[PDB]
Enzyme design. Structure first.
Site, PDB file in Angstrom:
ATOM      1  N   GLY A 157       0.309   5.808   0.772  1.00  0.00           N
ATOM      2  CA  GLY A 157      -0.425   6.832   1.121  1.00  0.00           C
ATOM      3  C   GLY A 157       0.376   8.187   0.970  1.00  0.00           C
ATOM      4  N   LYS A 193       6.756  -0.577   7.158  1.00  0.00           N
ATOM      5  CA  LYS A 193       6.266   0.719   6.974  1.00  0.00           C
ATOM      6  C   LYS A 193       7.550   1.838   6.465  1.00  0.00           C
ATOM      7  CE  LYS A 193       2.325   2.022   8.919  1.00  0.00           C
ATOM      8  NZ  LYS A 193       1.345   2.742   9.674  1.00  0.00           N
ATOM      9  N   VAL A 227       3.664   0.536   2.590  1.00  0.00           N
ATOM     10  CA  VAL A 227       3.769  -0.539   3.489  1.00  0.00           C
ATOM     11  C   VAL A 227       4.195  -1.548   2.445  1.00  0.00           C
ATOM     12  CG1 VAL A 227       2.495  -2.185   4.560  1.00  0.00           C
ATOM     13  CG2 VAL A 227       1.921   0.367   4.597  1.00  0.00           C
ATOM     14  N   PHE A 232       1.792   9.466   3.577  1.00  0.00           N
ATOM     15  CA  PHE A 232       2.772   9.534   4.542  1.00  0.00           C
ATOM     16  C   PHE A 232       3.698   8.491   4.339  1.00  0.00           C
ATOM     17  CE2 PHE A 232       2.439  12.927   7.377  1.00  0.00           C
ATOM     18  CZ  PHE A 232       0.930  13.411   6.957  1.00  0.00           C
ATOM     19  N   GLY A 233       3.777   7.570   3.484  1.00  0.00           N
ATOM     20  CA  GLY A 233       4.744   6.627   3.073  1.00  0.00           C
ATOM     21  C   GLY A 233       4.035   5.335   2.329  1.00  0.00           C
ATOM     22  N   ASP A 271      -9.393   5.673  12.822  1.00  0.00           N
ATOM     23  CA  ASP A 271      -9.574   4.889  11.471  1.00  0.00           C
ATOM     24  C   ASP A 271      -9.891   3.683  11.623  1.00  0.00           C
ATOM     25  OD1 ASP A 271      -9.730   4.940   8.686  1.00  0.00           O
ATOM     26  OD2 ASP A 271      -7.700   5.391   8.321  1.00  0.00           O
ATOM     27  N   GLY A 307       0.908  -1.263   0.044  1.00  0.00           N
ATOM     28  CA  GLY A 307      -0.010  -0.031  -0.009  1.00  0.00           C
ATOM     29  C   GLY A 307       0.960   1.193   0.126  1.00  0.00           C
TER      30      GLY A 307
END
Ligand code: 242
Ligand code: 242
EC number: 2.7.10.2
Lengths: 244, 244
Positions: free
Chosen positions: B23, B42, B28, B25-26, B128, B21
């Site tokens: 996003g 991560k 995975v 912010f970084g 979340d 994944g």
């Protein structure tokens, strides 16, 4: 070192090699026991490892399962043991001689599925053939490599030692002939020098008796002279799975 | 200090193989530590993040994804155990998914509730909470995580409570509302909620096959006034003591 690290080692003392299953230039393959009662297969590597990490990273339903390793030489790589042995040997058993083309293609599909993963992970088998395929307890196929070291090698590999996943595709086509023929050696009655000489003139194996023309064209795609023209394993799996 | 816990590892010991994944912010990734230890990694984009690692250690619990180590050199890595079945929304879709019965579907709900119950204890706020952030082990046990990578962690429209969307006031009660939403994903094989800001005072109609008793729970989760929503400690008991 870290508390979370997988400890894949076992003392050499806990293993008992019972029957040698094979021998090659780089070692031996044995059927043995871990701690007295767990049956396992052991590959002893002639002293004088990256394989184990490789196996772990290729962990898949369609590839032989790594169990453990012995760190001191002779290095041991331990795995699950298959009663049914290799595909070539199993195809020649009464149970195997009777498999219908439908079941045979399901097995080919399984193999294609594994090679598709190997391709996904950017690895190259280099010795794909029925002899390196293991049959599970439920008669499913698992990719392996234990020749410990040809009729299965692509022209480019024979001529220039250039191996790629496309070269594996060529080998896969040959493997298909082994499958449909219930274990017949490829190029019946042809010696290795004769195979290379015939390949020099664009020769291709004749369609096996009992091999549907449709399956045979799939093989011919695998044996295209230009590596790039050969199909992907994702394609091969798709066709084999939806064959009938 | 000699007594401070060790938790870092050289970046060089990690091989990132498959991105899972990404996003703002970084990212995975699924990778391997020192060759044969499968882990989740991560990587947070250089240009604060370690606070996430401390939070995870402080929230260490059977029902929360387990922290393994970090890389302190930018880009910062947060390494954890790898859950073979991935997220719950993914797993609920698998054929072997939702082939599950309310009995099991609910034991998983209770596990999540147990996780949040601890988060409640520790005065933390998830913000979340959704099936996509729930991980499923090899043994089909669930664990709470957070990796959408869209917001910096510091101690989601369809899953967010009205007051959160409206005034940005997130509390354990907001998570309670999210859990109520999460439950609908569970009885639906991960169906997206509200098959919404403007309808929000509308409430979801019961999902096809969900026990009216499991709906009345969702409704308590979705009470307008946050203080009227039930503590997770409560949801945990009802989800466990369900078929008694
Ligand atoms: C004991 C052993 C250790 C490693 C490998 C092996 O396949 N290694 C390997 C090395 C490189 C790449 C692959 C790949 F990618 F095919 F999985 C696999 C195979 C075996 C092995 C050989 C013979 C066997 N016979 C029977 N009846 N059961 C199990 C085995 C297992
Ligand atoms: C690599 C990684 C690092 C941190 C966190 C994570 O959940 N951090 C976190 C941040 C804030 C709060 C919590 C809480 F509350 F769950 F503890 C947890 C999760 C992961 C992570 C992402 C995806 C994954 N996929 C699979 N298949 N297995 C494991 C992971 C682990």
């Amino acid at each position: 070192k870290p508390w979370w690290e997988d400890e894949w080692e076992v003392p050499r003392e806990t293993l008992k090699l019972v029957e040698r299953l094979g021998a090659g230039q780089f070692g031996e393959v044995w059927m043995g026991y871990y701690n007295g009662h767990t049956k396992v297969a052991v590959k002893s590597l002639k002293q004088g490892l990256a394989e184990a990490n490789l196996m772990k990273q290729l962990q898949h339903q369609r590839l032989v399962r790594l169990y453990a390793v012995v760190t001191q030489e002779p290095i041991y790589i331990i795995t699950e043991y298959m009663e049914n042995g290799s595909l070539v040997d199993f195809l020649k058993t009464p149970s195997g001689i009777k498999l219908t083309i439908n079941k045979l293609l399901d097995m080919a599909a399984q193999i294609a599925e594994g090679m598709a993963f190997i391709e996904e992970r950017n690895y190259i088998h280099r010795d794909l053939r029925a002899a390196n395929i293991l049959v599970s307890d439920t008669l499913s196929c698992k990719i392996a490599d234990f020749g410990l070291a040809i009729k299965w090698t692509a022209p480019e590999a024979i001529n220039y030692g250039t191996f790629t996943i496309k070269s594996d595709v060529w080998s896969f086509g040959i493997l298909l002939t082994e499958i449909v023929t219930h274990g017949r050696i490829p190029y019946p009655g042809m010696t290795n020098p004769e195979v290379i000489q015939n390949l020099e003139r664009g020769y291709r194996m004749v369609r096996p008796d009992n091999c549907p023309e449709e399956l045979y064209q799939l093989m011919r795609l695998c044996w295209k002279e230009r590596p790039e023209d050969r199909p992907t394993f994702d394609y091969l799996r798709s066709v084999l799975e939806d064959f009938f």
